[PDB]
Structure 1
Amino acid sequence: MFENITAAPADPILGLADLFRADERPGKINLGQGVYKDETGKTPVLTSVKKAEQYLLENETTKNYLGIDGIPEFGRCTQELLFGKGSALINDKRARTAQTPGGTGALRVAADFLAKNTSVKRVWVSNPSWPNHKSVFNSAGLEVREYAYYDAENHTLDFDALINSLNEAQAGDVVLFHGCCHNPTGIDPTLEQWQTLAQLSVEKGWLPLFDFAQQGFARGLEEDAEGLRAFAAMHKELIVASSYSKNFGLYNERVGACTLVAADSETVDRAFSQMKAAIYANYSNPPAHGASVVATILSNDALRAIWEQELTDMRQRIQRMRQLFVNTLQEKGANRDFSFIIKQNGMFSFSGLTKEQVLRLREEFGVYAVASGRVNVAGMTPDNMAPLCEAIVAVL
């Protein structure tokens, strides 16, 4: 049965990580991966997380199954984070949240739920997007189409091209929005622009699907949710895939959420029952430990305050690196203006380097970025900045 199975192609992200480990050069620099790194180059466990895990170790008396939608508090705290305390959506009970194995699991649960219980055939994502979106939706049998997004001259949101593009989307198509900190570009809509997309989408009949991978990494927890909130104010129906991977540093524990919103509480409950069947036929029920850490942090005043500062420190260190990057490039002699990096948000920026330029940075300089030019800004530190920028300057 297996004699003739075609190999899965390469995978440059792992390919890059492999090439990076085997690189026996002292001053190699990884900007190619998807996780936060602190000033030291490490992806540490947050102090708040460690305290939560201790508490769970001392107080857990069973590992009995969670319900299909996971820990009730987790869902409640997730809904407040996304929609704000006081949200009519929450008051009217129009939102149901399932705990999922990460943001990816959330996208997959949404994808299966739609493919099986609606007429949805098609999902629109930005060009470029993170490449897993396409594979998740394709697996549930959903076509994926691209909308224009990035302006390559100006390193900016090509808004006219985006709108023009999406006029091709029919009533009943899904349109996926990165809630903040666009992956791979770092370029987000302004509030004025979100508001405009919200109007267009109700007029055209799109089901909005928000992907929140980095809430708290642009300007703050609440600010970063504004776009989603402008849509929430306008729409009867939407879906949110969220991840706690980056903002709690809980990558490997698979801590995410799929949140379903419908016109009313009777409707969301009915729809959600089928979202639960879709979880049931997949991984049955979600993994406790990570989500439990999150719920125990969010629902405790002291731990939440510690965690909010930790999140603020990550956001600011990225912001200082964006600025040190541009300032160091100007003074190592760079033949372009990079101040567009400052206006970009979160862990990622399109550097504007060519695929040949990134290839060269790897081979000559041991500086590793993704083929598209995506850099992880958190991969920069005050110590590796000088040589990072020298190398780039040399390739321009």
Structure 2
Amino acid sequence: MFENITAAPADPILGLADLFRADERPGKINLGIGVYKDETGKTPVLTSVKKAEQYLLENETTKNYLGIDGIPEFGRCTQELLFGKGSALINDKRARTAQTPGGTGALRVAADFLAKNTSVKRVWVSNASWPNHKSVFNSAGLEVREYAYYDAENHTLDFDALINSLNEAQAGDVVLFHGCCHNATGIDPTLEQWQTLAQLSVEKGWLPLFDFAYQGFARGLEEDAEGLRAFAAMHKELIVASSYSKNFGLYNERVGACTLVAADSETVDRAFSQMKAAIRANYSNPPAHGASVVATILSNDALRAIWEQELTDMRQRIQRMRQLFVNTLQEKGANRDFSFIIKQNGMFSFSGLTKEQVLRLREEFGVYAVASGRVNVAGMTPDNMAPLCEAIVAVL
């Protein structure tokens, strides 16, 4: 039965990792990472998390199954975070949240749900985006199309090409938007651009699906939710796939949520029922640990205060690195202008390096980056900044 099965291709990252590892060089630098890293180059457990885990250890009296949608408080806390407290969506009971196995899990669940309970056949994803979006939707039997977003020339958001490409999309088609910290350009729309897309979306009959994996990494918790909040105020229906992997550093515990928004309570409840059915047929019910931690932190004034501070430190670490990277480049005698790096949010950005420059960087300098020139700024340290910039300069 498995004799003729052909090997799946790779996932460059894991491939890059192994190569990195098996490298005897000393000054090696891995910028191909997909997680946050501190000044020492590690991905530590948050202090607030560790505290929450101690609390669970001492209070948990059972590991009995959670409901299909998971922990209730996790759901309400998640909603407040997304829509802000006092939101009508909330007071109107128009949103239902399901705890899922990470952000990817949320995406998959939304996909299976749409594929069996609606007429959706196509999902539009931005270009230069997170490659895993394609596989998730395709796996549910959905068509995936690409809209223009990034401008590899000017390193910016080509709003015209965007609006223009999105005109080829039909009513009932889904359009996927990154809430903030676009992966992997780091280029987000302005509040005014968000409001324009929202207006246009309603006019065209699109079903917006938000991929929100970096809340708090661009400007702050509330700020980062402006775009989504702009859409929510204008739409009857909406879908949000959120992740807590990065902002809580809970990567391996698979913590995320899928939020369904309908015109009214009666409708969201009827629609949510089919979402649960989709879940029951996948993994049955969600993993409690990670989600319990989140609910414990978000609901504790003390712990929450500590966590917000840890998140701020992460955000600022990143902003510092972007700035420090551009300066060290200019100093080291950088041929080109890299100031655009400072206008981009989150951990990722396209360096603008050619495929051949990337290859050279690694072969000759032990500097690791994805062939697309994408780099993870959290892989930079005040310590490695100099050797990094000198290498790059050498390949320009």
Considering the TM-score relative to the shorter chain, is it more than 0.5?
Answer: yes
The superposition leaves residues 76-119 of structure 1 with CA deviations (integer Å, 9 ceiling, x where unpaired) of 01001100011110000000000000000000000000000000
Q: Does 1:184 align with 2:189?
A: no
Structure 1 residue 264 displacement after superposition: 0.3
Following TM superposition, by how much is the alpha carbon of 1:371 offset from its aligned partner in structure 2, in angstroms? Answer: 1.2
Once residues 371 and 69 of structure 2 are traced to their aligned partners in structure 1, the CA distance between those partners, rounded to angstroms, is 38
With the length of structure 2 as denominator, give the TM-score of the two structures: 0.99
SS of the residue 2:233 aligns to: helix
Deviations 1:231-279 (A, max 9, x none): 0000000100000000000000000000000000000000000000000
Measured after TM superposition, the shift of residue 10 of structure 1 is: 2.3
Distance (whole Å) between structure 2 residues aligned to residue 137 and residue 33 of structure 1? 24
Residues 365-374 or 103-112, more deviating = 365-374
After TM superposition, the structure 1 stretch with the greater mean CA deviation from structure 2, 113-122 or 5-14, is 5-14
SS of equivalent to 1:239:
strand
Q: Determine helix, strand or coil for the equivalent of 1:167.
A: coil
- Counterpart position of 2:364: 364
The separation in 1 between residues aligned to 2:27 and 2:182, in whole angstroms, is 29
1:121-151 per-residue CA deviation (whole Å, 9 max, x = no partner) reads: 0000000110100000000000000000111
Q: SS at 1:289's partner residue?
A: helix
SS of equivalent to 1:86: coil
Alignment partners' CA distance in 1, 2:355 and 2:241 = 31
Taking the aligned partners of 2:34 and 2:90, their CA distance within structure 1 comes to 32
Task: Measure how far apart 1:358 and its partner are.
Answer: 1.0
The structural deviation recorded for 1:323 is: 0.3
Give the C-alpha shift of residue 11 in structure 1: 2.0
Cα deviations by residue, 1:157-183 (Å, 9 ceiling, x for unpaired) = 011001000000000000000000000
Q: How far apart in 1 are the matches of 2:191 and 2:28?
A: 39
Alignment length, in residue pairs? 396
TM-score, structure 1 as length reference: 0.99
How far apart, in 2, do the equivalents of 1:69 and 1:362 lie? Answer: 45
**Could you tell me how far 1:54 is from its partner in structure 2?**
0.4
Unaligned runs of 5+ in 2: none
In the alignment, the residues of structure 1 paired with residue 362 and residue 138 of structure 2 have an alpha-carbon distance, to the nearest angstrom, of 32
User: SS at 2:270's partner residue?
Assistant: helix
Partner-residue secondary structure (3-state), 2:144: strand
Instruction: Supply the distance in 2 between the matched residues of 1:213 and 1:368 (Cα, whole angstroms).
Output: 24
Shifted more, 117-126 versus 10-19: the winner is 10-19
Distance 1:17 1:392 in 2: 20
Q: What is the CA–CA distance in structure 1 between the aligned matches of 2:11 and 2:339, rounded to whole Å?
A: 32
Q: Aligned to 1:234, what secondary structure does the other structure show?
A: coil
Instruction: Tell me the secondary structure at the aligned position of residue 362 of structure 2.
Output: helix
CA shift at 1:360, angstroms?
Answer: 1.1
Distance in 1 of aligned mates of 2:243 and 2:276: 19
In the alignment, the residues of structure 2 paired with residue 209 and residue 6 of structure 1 have an alpha-carbon distance, to the nearest angstrom, of 33
Aligned partners of 2:89, 2:132: CA distance in 1, in Å?
30
- Superposed displacement of residue 356, structure 1: 1.2
SS in 2 for 1:316: helix
TM-fit CA distance, 1:373: 1.1
For the pair 1:395 / 2:373, whether they are aligned, the reply is no
Which residue does the alignment assign to 1:224?
A: 224
- For residue 257 of structure 2, give the secondary structure of its aligned residue in structure 1: strand
Cα distance in 1 between the residues matched to 2:162 and 2:355? 24
| Alignment partners' CA distance in 2, 1:370 and 1:239 | 31
Deviation, 1:58, is 0.5
Instruction: Percent identity, please.
Output: 99
**In structure 2, distance between residues paired with 1:303 and 1:221:** 16
The residue matched to 1:144 in structure 2 has which SS?
strand
Shift in Å at residue 348 of structure 1? 0.6
Distance 2:333 2:266 in 1: 62
What is the DSSP-based 3-state SS (H/G/I as helix, E as strand, rest coil) of the residue aligned with 1:327? helix
Q: Displacement of 1:217 after TM fit?
A: 0.2
Deviates more, 1:19-28 or 1:249-258: 19-28
Matches of 1:98 and 1:24 in 2, distance apart?
46
Instruction: Please give the alpha-carbon distance, in whole angstroms, between the structure 1 residues aligned to 2:86 and 2:359.
Output: 50
C-alpha deviation, 1:369, in angstroms:
1.0
**Gap regions ≥5 residues in structure 1:** none
